């Protein structure tokens, strides 16, 4: 049973400007098997209406998904993506950095 751990990137759809509407993305890729738990966080709390892409995969058979929701960045608020997968002993949290 091949088990590949997800790579994670968290980023905005458009250039980040405080006060302006935008989209927060969590891109998970390179994982196997396909069962995975992904949440977007605002100040440590799970954001409720998050959508995601249809499951697809790369040439090396590893899966990828895009999770996303509308958001408005501020200097106050802290956003993150939380990922769980069979390869992970506990959920991995990646913080949104508007610079990466």
């Amino acid at each position: 049973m091949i088990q590949r751990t997800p790579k994670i990137q968290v980023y905005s759809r458009h250039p980040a400007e405080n006060g302006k509407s935008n989209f927060l993305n969590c891109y998970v890729s390179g994982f196997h098997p396909s069962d995975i738990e992904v949440d977007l966080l605002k100040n440590g709390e799970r954001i409720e209406k998050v959508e995601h892409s249809d499951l697809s995969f790369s040439k090396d058979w590893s899966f990828y998904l895009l999770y996303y929701t509308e958001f408005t960045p501020t200097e106050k608020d802290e956003y993150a993506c939380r990922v769980n997968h069979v390869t992970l002993s506990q959920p991995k949290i990646v913080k949104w950095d508007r610079d990466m």
Binding site: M1, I2, R4, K7, Q9, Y11, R13, H14, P15, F23, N25, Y27, S29, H32, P33, S34, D35, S53, D54, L55, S56, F57, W61, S62, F63, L66, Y68, D99, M100
Partner: protein, 274 residues
């Protein structure tokens, strides 16, 4: 330039109760245009790009009919593979299938593909000649013999070289306003001080299509790969893609460094400086 149409199928068995979860997606180049999800209410092949909504009810009935047959084939396959590999009924397993065709700039057939994986590993794949098979292990070798006896390759060959290319040409026409348009990367550079003597230059490429792109750094006109970091190209979520590449430099020496951007939407490679 070149174009492709590809379909991706994933089936995952669910031990304990009922049929596998089945998900099918179709792409033209980097644009998803259809989906089927067994867990969704419609039980129809559904549109995922505006230009495929041009297709009428006979299209959707036919794609629905065919994709449900694909689902049932995978269901049987998961049972067969469980047998071949002497696995119990207690675990969840995965079959993946991908097939499709590439055309070059003349939109004539260039390459075809049809390959299968079980639990994330190569199982069986049609070879480039579309006439023979690559079986990864002895289980797959049994399938190869079966498919040779039933002349599967010859029938795949006809679709991949013919029907698949016709579909692609039709889609490229109906979706011309987006499918035949290239979106050149919007580029800029950022600068971050880590210490009084070390800085990071980050070269951004945003909003480009298709996803294929090259970002490279040079110092004093020579390629630099040391002390660089490059992220995997990622979807923006609006159909376009993003990528960046960064280099660590001595504070004060920023002007030595240039970022070079290659993309088919760019008539000539682009050079960025801080």
């Amino acid at each position: 330039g070149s174009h492709s149409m590809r379909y991706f199928f994933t089936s995952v068995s669910r031990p304990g109760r009922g049929e596998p979860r089945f998900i099918a997606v179709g792409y033209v180049d980097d644009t998803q245009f259809v989906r089927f999800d067994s867990d969704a209410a419609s039980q129809r092949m559904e549109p995922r790009a505006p230009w495929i909504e041009q297709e009428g009810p006979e299209y959707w009935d036919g794609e629905t009919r065919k994709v449900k047959a694909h689902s049932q084939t995978h269901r049987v396959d998961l049972g067969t593979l469980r047998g071949y590999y002497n696995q119990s009924e207690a675990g969840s397993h995965t079959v993946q299938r991908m097939y499709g065709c590439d055309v070059g700039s003349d939109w004539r057939f260039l390459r075809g593909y049809h390959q299968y994986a079980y639990d994330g590993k190569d199982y069986i794949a049609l070879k480039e000649d579309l006439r023979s098979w690559t079986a990864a292990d002895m289980a797959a070798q049994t399938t190869k013999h079966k498919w040779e006896a039933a002349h599967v390759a010859e029938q795949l060959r006809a679709y991949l070289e013919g029907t698949c290319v016709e579909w692609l040409r039709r889609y490229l026409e109906n979706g011309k306003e987006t499918l035949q348009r290239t979106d050149a990367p919007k580029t800029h550079m950022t600068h971050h001080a880590v210490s009084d003597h070390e800085a990071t230059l980050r070269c951004w490429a945003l909003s480009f299509y298709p996803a294929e792109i090259t970002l490279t750094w040079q110092r004093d006109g020579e390629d630099q790969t040391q002390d660089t970091e490059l992220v995997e190209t990622r979807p923006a979520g609006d159909g376009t893609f993003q990528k960046w590449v960064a280099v660590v430099v001595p504070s004060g020496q920023e002007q030595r460094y240039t970022c070079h951007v290659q993309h088919e939407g760019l008539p000539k490679p682009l050079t960025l400086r801080w």
